[PDB]
């Protein structure tokens, strides 16, 4: 019953600070991806930096046709107080909803209670496509905040693999073997292995290792932009102007 | 039962292409962290790119005091043929062991059989500390290779949080609020909140949000290096050199 | 529900290095017998000798209307590398498919996990006729290759038995008592025992032991050819021409 | 618990036409191997041909240190009548005992009731070593007699494999690749594979496929004798002196 | 579960040395009573004496409209061998069938496995009328043969009692109180007891004990012939003619 | 459990018109056999004639060291009333006790409730030796009185078999093959069968059929006297002396 | 279901010495009440005295429209014998039937087996009205005979209560407070209580305690007759004319 | 669990309007019998008449060494109000305690809840001796008051039966057969039957029916007084002096 990559997102009605919605239907029916992420508790500092990081990247997620939804065991009233504090003290509207899960119904159903806290959810991330299918899951602990630019690279890389019918190498678009190359799924039969090594259609190392470069310069560079922002020392910290 | 952040890694004897070892004992004995990661099948191309990416970073993992161990349902024989092919055809030695799990016993024990494949493990990652405790868990799918520099960032940041007694903000060491600043865990009582507010000893936005910058230049530059490697187009591609 | 002589081969879809097929239907509806045989692991040396042995005798099986199909817990990728290696280094194509059973689904269903290995199948043999019925079952251990010419003698003897409505004596067609004689099924009633004895139709030792010699010379000599190949020192060892 | 290769032969007291004995203890205490084989019913003609075939080879089994013991659901009285009939009519004394199993207690325990007959046992074979471990198992049907010379070859090849620490290739001692060579068990680690590739102590095709020729002339000629006898038309048939 | 007097004989298909029959329908359809009796084993000497005694009395059973069917755990092959031996060596043909019950299916259904032997049935007798109803059941042990003249008396006595609507006194037709008299079933009410005491219809000791003599001279002399044959030392012994 | 030949008589305390006793202890502890028999109901006419038959035969049972105990569902009060009535109207004392079993505890324990009556026991017979072991069981119906002389023959013959180490042929001591001969237990092994035929100690038909005449003339004539009494017309009927 | 006052008498078919009847149907269909009473065993002396006492009051029961049925575990034959003996030796015919309950089926259903006897029913009384409803239940022990005139007082007093819609005081018709007075069912509401004490319709001690004298002289004398009979020493004892 | 004649009264702690007592120990300890009797509800008219009737016979019960104790589901407060109303309005002190059983705990344990009322207890009577064994149980309904003189007769008759070792006939001491005669327990064995009929110590009708007159003239007249009081039309009704 615990959610697995390849499964449809568990059917459920949830309460947010925007209202009552059905997952994943509410996002499927709009042909949108969504990223559901959880944090241990409202007003906790790592969780605040993470809400700000998501909010700075809102436009980036909207350009990929991805919506954001948060999750904690706090009240809708705590969610509203907290979003008002972020907008007033750091100067950033949190435009996306947070799910209010006080009895841990959503937390338990998605397996978000681990051994570090009996009461507060882990830093779970569920990347869910427009078919409502779980494509990737990450579990960060209390003491460590997420690298949000990796969540963007994942959705970007996944959307390209879907459209170009390709697999995505390690560290794409900066793969040490094939750089921005995308991988052709390997042959699973003797006939297909022979047809692959005879066609000369694709660069190869092997019958099992064929790739080409069918991603646009724009898609490659947008994906590299996300990691560049992750590696850049910030221009001006938001604590200075606060 | 399913492995969770904060639990000791489940006791098990596993067969690797280096021999039989007890997890997590084999690494705890040595005071070493370990990253156990899994891949669907030997000789699959994304998996090849990930093994090369890990092997390129072996030395970076060793300096942090982290050992690596792979996991698929292939035989020790398939593991030895595959590693010799990567060394011969790519010029890269895989120095770390791979667990062989032909009946999916380790796969089932670690819940690495997700819904994309009935027979092959997901791209799972378990980051385990020198005490044998699960600290973080990632689940990438078949079609998407991992960003290994993020795994390095995770270990660096966690080891930093452990020794400096701090929580790590989103996108550390490039957080948009506090940059390379590290967070003081928040008050949990009225007296702690009043004492925090009054002390003046730490930069703060609120009783809940206090930080400082105790990380050495070398600690920060090290984390910065990992993300710069993640963001830069490689100098030359390994497919060209062969 | 574990498999027994006289039972229909268990209904199942299996993945091979030729594609996905339904057993036993794929062979039944072509009007063909199949020998399903299993080996512990791809690249293992006794297993190589046995693939080479089966391949050498491929024409002999096709003359009997028998298809061959292998099984190990290895990937479809390991099968392709393994067969490629045998063809290139020994100089023999393996023309017949191998089932890939990485999670042991097919192994457990056919009882091929014995006590020498928790992970790898015994050297199992299921001889299945054109109706889809198990006719014979052999189980060899890891340390001992099969005598494939006995599998030829068994199919040939069963097919004669079926065709001429006879039973086949020990060591046919070199039985010490009746040589190339085939055996009449014994009477099961007083009346049939009396009739058989007042008959003079067949050579008898007794009302329960009647036989004739209705096998063609071709069929006797073909069966004896299998055994002579088994007894004969080879003219040149394939290791030499490599 | 249906018996498996590498398991201890199930503990049991059985009644034979020589008396009550405990298996496997009665053969283990003598440092003797035993072949337990079963037949459907006393006085059936294939079964008769098989007892004569075993009896003629009895001396061959004795020289290997193998004892024989039969099995049907018939009474000790039927066993005595049948053996006295064979000795009188065919001129061959059956020297080895037969288990009498009227309620099918031993048949059920050993799983020897298959779907050709509700009431009569298949032609099962259990090759058990001097430590009482099941080493090989064969299941022949009602309509097909055994090739007894294969059972001598299995035992000879197993005792060679045990005492020379070797695995036996397909169709030994007439293997098409290495003839009478015995296979050195493959490496299961990177270190062991490189050490074997470097030592040049054995002929090899591969780090996984090393062999030598340590079986004596007598060992090889003995095995070839079994297969030669299986291949040759008998010098004169026994039915002639009825 | 265990069969009782007044119950239909359990529905079953049995295999005999005359072929396959349903009990009790095979006899019910012919209008025939039957006696099913069991013996421990073919070729056992008390069992031989019983078959010979039953054969001797076969005409007597047939005249009563009674067929005989035997039962043991031996094969049809043992049944034909034994009956052949009885005919050649004692000069007596066994005309009736014997059930073959090698897995004790019939024996266990009929409760014929007692504690003298785990594998061989007792000397059970089932007397079944033409409606297929069990009328009487006897159980003799291994060491003691049946008095077959008592089974003829039981059948004759039941048939007389059935047609005359009478009950049959101890030791009929030589009862010490009423001789060859048959008993009127007693009154079960006050009125019936008053009516019997008043009628004058029957010789009475009591309202509960009335009898008349409605059996024919022939019926009584038939029953005396059975007991006469039982008491008299045979004129010549059949061992003398062997 | 339902009682079986070769088992110890079920342990049970019973009430009789002589007092409370344990079975079979009451008779074992005196070194005495017993015949336990059951009748449907006190005052029923067939049951009356059977009590009279047993009483007349009482001295014959005493001479064999056999005690008699009856059984019905009636009261100890009904037993005394019934025995007094038999004594006054037939002039025959019933010397042996009757068990009272009003709730059918004894009836259900000994399986004496068959399908002819839900409330009254069949005419059951249990012949129990001085070790308290059941040697024979008879089940006569409501409508048919027992032949009590066959119960004396059974006990006499069991005691001779026991005392002489012999088995007793059909209809002893008037067996058609060997007359008053007793049978030697058959050989159960090849060596015993060979030694049996080498001996010449016994008249044989066969290695399986040997006999001698070891019973005294007095034992034979006593046995024949029982059957002669059974076959004799009574000299004067007890109803005539009412 | 242990029977309760106010419940319908349990549906059952019972056998008596008059034939087979359905309770309570057989009485309900006549508009008759019935007293079913049980005794431990026929021929027991208290039981004899109770049967005479009931018989003696038969016509009083007939005048009240009440029939009588007895119950013991003895047979119908013991019932007839016993009723004959009472009539012959005491000069009182028992007109009413007795249920025969040999396997204690009726005894168990009605809970008549208490702890003085494991095998004989208590002296139980079920007073059942013309609707088949249990109205009163009495349980006397083995050693104490009933006072039958109290059972007459119960049926008389219930019929007056049902008919005149009244309750009956203790010791009616000689109650110390209101004598032959019958009680008005009390108010169960405040309105009824106030209404009762206003109307002056009835003699009263209290709103809860109201009574009148609606029973006829004849019904009161009858009830006084039953208790006068219970109190008076009989002039002529029945033993004195036996 | 439900209480039976011959069983010890169930162990229980009860609360009464005199305090908390253990039953039956509180009456066993004093060597006293007790009559536990129940009534539906305090203030109900029939129940009032029964309490008055017990209270007026209190002296008689104390002479027999019998204590009285009531039971209803009313509270102790209701018991005290009720007893005080009876004493003030009828002039009769209730000296004995009443059990308060408001959750039906006693009522349920004693089976006092029948189908006439779901909430109120029937008119149960438990007569319990100085060993605390139940000797007699009576169940009267709501609409009908008890005849208390009969409870007196029962205790007297039982006490006499016990000390004179005798059974008590129907309607003692006015039995129609033997008047105040008491009954010798019947013989239960043949020897006891014929000794009884040979002794001549007892007046007899039968071996089963013996009696004498060992009860004192006082004992008989005291028992007869109880029944005379029951039969007497009252001198002065207590309502005429309320």
Q: Among C15, C41, C118, whose Cβ lies nearest the Cβ of B77?
A: C41
Looking at CA atoms only, how far is residue C193 from chain E in angstroms?
8
User: How many Cβ atoms sit within 10 Å of the Cβ of residue F18?
Assistant: 19
CA nearest to B46 within chain A: A169
C-alpha distances in Å from residue F165, one per residue of E123, F71, F162, F182, F189: 19, 33, 5, 9, 19
Structure letter (DSSP) for residue D176: T
Cβ neighbours of B137 in A, within 8 Å: 138-139
CA distance G242 to G197: 61
Q: What is the CATH number of the domain that holds D233?
A: 3.30.1020.10
Q: Among G42, G78, G103, whose Cβ lies nearest the Cβ of F104?
A: G103
Grouping H, G, I as helix, E, B as strand and the rest as coil, residue D22 is strand
Say whether both H186 and H155 belong to one domain. yes
CA distance F23 to C181: 66
Looking at CA atoms only, how far is residue D27 from chain F in angstroms?
19
Site from D77, D86, D115 to mutate, E interface, most E CB atoms within 10 angstroms: D77
The chains in contact with chain F, meaning 3 or more Cβ pairs closer than 8 Å, are D, E, G, H
Which residues make beta-bridge pairs with C167? C183
Grouping H, G, I as helix, E, B as strand and the rest as coil, residue H58 is helix
The chains in contact with chain B, meaning 3 or more Cβ pairs closer than 8 Å, are A, C, D
CA distance C217 to C223: 10
Ramachandran angles phi, psi of D238, nearest 5°: -75, -30
Residue whose pair of structure tokens reads 């504090």 in the numeric block: A85
Inter-chain touch C41–B75, beta carbons under 8 Å: yes
Q: Is C144 on the interface with D (CB under 8 A)?
A: yes
Looking at CA atoms only, how far is residue H25 from chain G in angstroms?
20
Q: How many domains does the structure of chain F reveal?
A: 2
Structure letter (DSSP) for residue D179: B
CA distance G99 to G74: 9
- Asked whether C and A share 3 or more beta-carbon pairs under 8 angstroms, the answer is yes
Residue spans of alpha helices (H) in chain G: 25-28, 45-56, 58-63, 76-90, 105-109, 148-163, 190-199, 217-231
> Are the C-beta atoms of G101 and G70 separated by less than 8 Å?
no
- Write out the residue range of the structural domain in which residue B238 sits: 144-242
Give the closest residue to F48 by CA, choosing from C198, D151, E207. E207
- The side-by-side arrangement of strands in the sheet containing B66-72 is A98-100, A66-72, A33-38, A123-128, A134-140, B134-140, B123-128, B33-37, B66-72, B98-100, B12-16, B19-23
The tokens describing E159, both together, are 């048939």
Report angle CA A176, A180, A181 to the nearest 5 degrees. 90
Q: Is B81 on the interface with C (CB under 8 A)?
A: yes
Q: Is H189 on the interface with F (CB under 8 A)?
A: yes
Task: Evaluate the omega torsion of the peptide bond into residue C24 and state whether it is cis, within 30 degrees of 0.
Answer: yes
Q: What is the CATH number of the domain that holds E90?
A: 3.40.30.10
Say whether both G133 and G151 belong to one domain. no
Give the closest residue to D146 by CA, choosing from D230, D217, D69, D221. D230
Angle separating helix axes E76-90 and E45-56, nearest 10 degrees: 70
Say whether both H69 and H164 belong to one domain. no
Give the closest residue to A214 by CA, choosing from A185, A184, A193, A186. A184
Site from F14, F16, F77, F96 to mutate, H interface, most H CB atoms within 10 angstroms: F77
Inter-chain touch F103–G81, beta carbons under 8 Å: no
Among candidate residues G122, G143, G164, the one where a domain is terminated: G143
User: How many Cβ atoms sit within 10 Å of the Cβ of residue H186?
Assistant: 24
Write the secondary structure of chain C as one string of H (helix), E (strand) and C (coil).
CCCCCCCECCCEEEEECCEEEEECHHHHCCCCEEEEECCCCCCCHHHHHHHHHHHHCHHHHHHCCEEEEEEECCCHHHHHHHHHHHHHHHCCCCCCCEEECCCCHHHHHCCCCCCCCCCCCCEEEEEECCCCEEEEEEEECCCECCCHHHHHHHHHHHHHHHHHCCEECCCCCCECCCECCEEECCCCCHHHHHHHHHHCCCEEEECCEEEECCCCHHHHHHHHHHHHHHHCCCCCCCCCCC
Inter-chain touch F104–G100, beta carbons under 8 Å: no
> Are the C-beta atoms of E137 and E145 separated by less than 8 Å?
no
Instruction: Collect all residues with Cβ–Cβ distance below 8 Å to D19 and sequence separation of at least 6.
Output: F189
Give the closest residue to B72 by CA, choosing from B126, B132, B119. B119
CA distance C186 to E165: 50
User: How many Cβ atoms sit within 10 Å of the Cβ of residue D233?
Assistant: 11
Task: Evaluate the omega torsion of the peptide bond into residue D24 and state whether it is cis, within 30 degrees of 0.
Answer: yes
Say whether both G43 and G114 belong to one domain. yes
CA distance E207 to H226: 46
Grouping H, G, I as helix, E, B as strand and the rest as coil, residue D39 is coil
CA distance D120 to E103: 8
The tokens describing A206, both together, are 């092997």
> Are the C-beta atoms of H157 and G156 separated by less than 8 Å?
no
Cβ neighbours of C76 in A, within 8 Å: 188-189
Site from D16, D17, D81 to mutate, F interface, most F CB atoms within 10 angstroms: D17
Inter-chain touch G104–F100, beta carbons under 8 Å: no
CA nearest to H186 within chain F: F77
Structure letter (DSSP) for residue E117: -
CA distance G171 to H46: 10
Burial readout D100-114 (b: 16 or more C-beta within 10 A, e: otherwise): bbbbbbbbebbbbbb
Inter-chain touch F169–E45, beta carbons under 8 Å: yes
CA nearest to F75 within chain H: H188
Q: Is H118 on the interface with G (CB under 8 A)?
A: no
Structure letter (DSSP) for residue B72: E
> Are the C-beta atoms of A81 and B208 separated by less than 8 Å?
no
- The side-by-side arrangement of strands in the sheet containing F182-184 is F182-184, F209-212, F203-206
> Are the C-beta atoms of A208 and A184 separated by less than 8 Å?
no
Instruction: Collect all residues with Cβ–Cβ distance below 8 Å to H225 and sequence separation of at least 6.
Output: none
Among candidate residues A143, A162, A188, the one where a domain is terminated: A143
Give residues 46 to 75 of F whose Cβ lies within 8 Å of E.
Answer: 46, 48-50, 52-53, 56
The CA dihedral of B140, B145, B147, B148, to the nearest 10 degrees, is: 100
Inter-chain touch E186–F45, beta carbons under 8 Å: yes
Give the closest residue to C33 by CA, choosing from C140, C135, C181, C178. C135
CA distance E59 to F203: 30
Say whether both A38 and A60 belong to one domain. yes
Q: In this complex, how many residue pairs, one in chain E and one in chain F, have their CB atoms less than 8 Å apart?
A: 262
Cβ neighbours of E86 in C, within 8 Å: none
Q: Is C210 on the interface with D (CB under 8 A)?
A: yes
C-alpha distances in Å from residue C117, one per residue of C113, D5, D110, D157, D185: 7, 10, 21, 20, 15
CA distance B198 to B192: 10
The tokens describing B4, both together, are 């969770």
Grouping H, G, I as helix, E, B as strand and the rest as coil, residue F6 is coil
Report angle CA E64, E66, E71 to the nearest 5 degrees. 150
Grouping H, G, I as helix, E, B as strand and the rest as coil, residue D29 is coil
Say whether both H112 and H151 belong to one domain. no
The tokens describing E194, both together, are 């008053």
Q: Among D186, D190, D208, whose Cβ lies nearest the Cβ of B17?
A: D190
CA distance A146 to A156: 17
> Are the C-beta atoms of C123 and C139 separated by less than 8 Å?
yes
Say whether both G148 and G125 belong to one domain. no
Looking at CA atoms only, how far is residue E73 from chain D in angstroms?
6
Say whether both B235 and B225 belong to one domain. yes
Q: What is the CA radius of gyration of chain D?
A: 20
Instruction: Collect all residues with Cβ–Cβ distance below 8 Å to H50 and sequence separation of at least 6.
Output: G170, H37, H39, H123, H145, H146, H148
CA nearest to F192 within chain D: D18
The chains in contact with chain A, meaning 3 or more Cβ pairs closer than 8 Å, are B, C
Cβ neighbours of E120 in D, within 8 Å: 75, 102
Grouping H, G, I as helix, E, B as strand and the rest as coil, residue H65 is coil
Inter-chain touch H176–G237, beta carbons under 8 Å: yes
Looking at CA atoms only, how far is residue B97 from chain D in angstroms?
9
Q: Is B156 on the interface with C (CB under 8 A)?
A: no
The tokens describing E232, both together, are 């008299």
- Asked whether H and E share 3 or more beta-carbon pairs under 8 angstroms, the answer is no
Write the secondary structure of F61-98 as one string of H (helix), E (strand) and C (coil).
HHHCCEEEEEEECCCHHHHHHHHHHHHHHHCCCCCCCE
Q: In this complex, how many residue pairs, one in chain A and one in chain B, have their CB atoms less than 8 Å apart?
A: 262
What is the sign of the dihedral through the CA atoms of C226, C228, C234 and C235? negative
Say whether both F113 and F160 belong to one domain. no
Give the closest residue to E105 by CA, choosing from D73, H180, H200. D73
Q: Among F146, F154, F179, whose Cβ lies nearest the Cβ of E144?
A: F154
Give the β-pairing of G123-128 and H123-128.
unpaired
Q: Is H80 on the interface with G (CB under 8 A)?
A: no
Say whether both E205 and E138 belong to one domain. no
Cβ neighbours of F102 in G, within 8 Å: 41, 73-74, 102, 104, 119-120
Cβ neighbours of F43 in G, within 8 Å: 75, 77-78, 81
Ramachandran angles phi, psi of E160, nearest 5°: -60, -50
Instruction: Collect all residues with Cβ–Cβ distance below 8 Å to C165 and sequence separation of at least 6.
Output: C185
DSSP B78-121: HHHHHHHHHHHHHS----S-EEE-TT-HHHHHTT---TT-SSS-
Ramachandran angles phi, psi of H217, nearest 5°: -60, -40
> Are the C-beta atoms of H101 and H14 separated by less than 8 Å?
yes
Residue whose pair of structure tokens reads 């009413």 in the numeric block: G96
The tokens describing G112, both together, are 């008549």
Among candidate residues F100, F127, F143, the one where a domain is terminated: F143
| Deposited experimental method | X-ray
Say whether both B137 and B150 belong to one domain. no
Say whether both G132 and G152 belong to one domain. no
Q: Is G82 on the interface with E (CB under 8 A)?
A: no
């Amino acid at each position: 019953s615990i959610p697995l990559i390849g499964e449809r997102f568990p059917e459920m009605e949830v309460t947010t600070d925007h209202g009552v919605i059905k997952l994943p239907d509410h996002y499927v029916s709009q042909g949108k991806w969504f990223v559901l992420f959880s944090h241990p508790a409202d007003f906790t500092p790592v969780s605040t930096t993470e809400f700000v990081s998501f909010a700075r990247r809102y436009e980036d997620f909207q350009r990929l046709g991805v919506d954001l939804i948060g999750l904690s065991v706090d009240s809708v009233f705590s969610h509203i107080k907290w979003k008002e504090w972020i907008e007033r003290h750091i100067g950033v509207r949190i435009p996306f909803p947070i799910i209010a899960d006080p009895q841990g119904t959503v937390a338990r159903r998605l397996g978000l209670l681990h051994a570090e806290s009996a009461t507060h959810t882990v830093r779970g991330v569920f990347i869910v496509d427009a078919r409502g299918v779980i494509r990737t899951m990450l579990y960060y602990p209390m003491e460590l905040g997420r690298l949000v630019d990796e969540i963007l690279r994942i959705v970007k890389a996944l959307k390209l693999g879907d459209s170009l019918k390709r697999a995505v190498p390690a560290d794409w678009p900066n793969n040490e073997i094939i750089g921005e190359g995308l991988i052709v799924p390997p042959p699973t039969t003797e006939d297909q292995a022979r047809a692959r090594m005879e066609s000369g259609q694709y660069r190869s190392l092997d019958w099992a290792f064929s790739w080409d470069t069918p991603a646009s310069r724009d898609d490659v560079e947008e994906a590299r932009r996300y990691l560049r922002r992750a590696a850049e020392k910030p221009a001006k910290l938001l604590y200075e102007e606060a």
